[PDB]
Amino acid sequence: LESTSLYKKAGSENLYFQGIVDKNKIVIPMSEFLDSMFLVIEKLGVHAEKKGSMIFLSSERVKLADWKQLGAMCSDCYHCKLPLSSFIEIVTRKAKDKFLVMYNEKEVTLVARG
C-alpha cells in the first residue's frame, strides 16, 4: 500500500530490456525509462505523467504520503508533483546497490559500481 515500496521489489530487469546494455553500463532513453517506472505503480492505482521536467502523480485508491515524505509537492493525499530528477533518484534507490545512477533530459545511465 506504499507505492514507492514497489520499486524495492521490481527488478532492473525492466531497465535491462529497455536499455542498451554494455559490460559496465546500461543507458536507457528517458521516455522508455519513465514509461517502465510509471507502469510499476500503475498496479496500486497510481497514475503518473511527465510534463516539462515535472512528474505528476494521482491516485484513486492509494494515498501518496510516502512520495510526500520523500519530497513531493502534494495538494492532497491523492495528488502530487515532483521534479524529474527527484523521481529518478527515488525509483532507482535499490539499483544504487549495484550502479552509479546519472542522467540528463535525454537518458538515464547506470554505471556498474567498482
Is residue 6 exposed (0-12), middle (13-18) or buried (19+ Cβ within 10 Å)?
Answer: middle
Is residue 9 exposed (0-12), middle (13-18) or buried (19+ Cβ within 10 Å)?
Answer: exposed
User: For residues 58 and 86, which CB has a smaller minimum distance to its own copies in the complex?
Assistant: 86
The C-alpha cell of 109 is what? 545511465
User: For residues 75 and 104, which CB has a smaller minimum distance to its own copies in the complex?
Assistant: 104
Name the segment binding its own copies (CB under 8 A); options: 2-10, 15-23, 46-54, 56-64.
Answer: 46-54
In the set 57, 82, 91, 95, which binds its own copies (CB under 8 A)? 82
Residues in contact with its own copies by CB under 8 A are: 52-54, 71, 82-86, 88-89, 100-105, 109
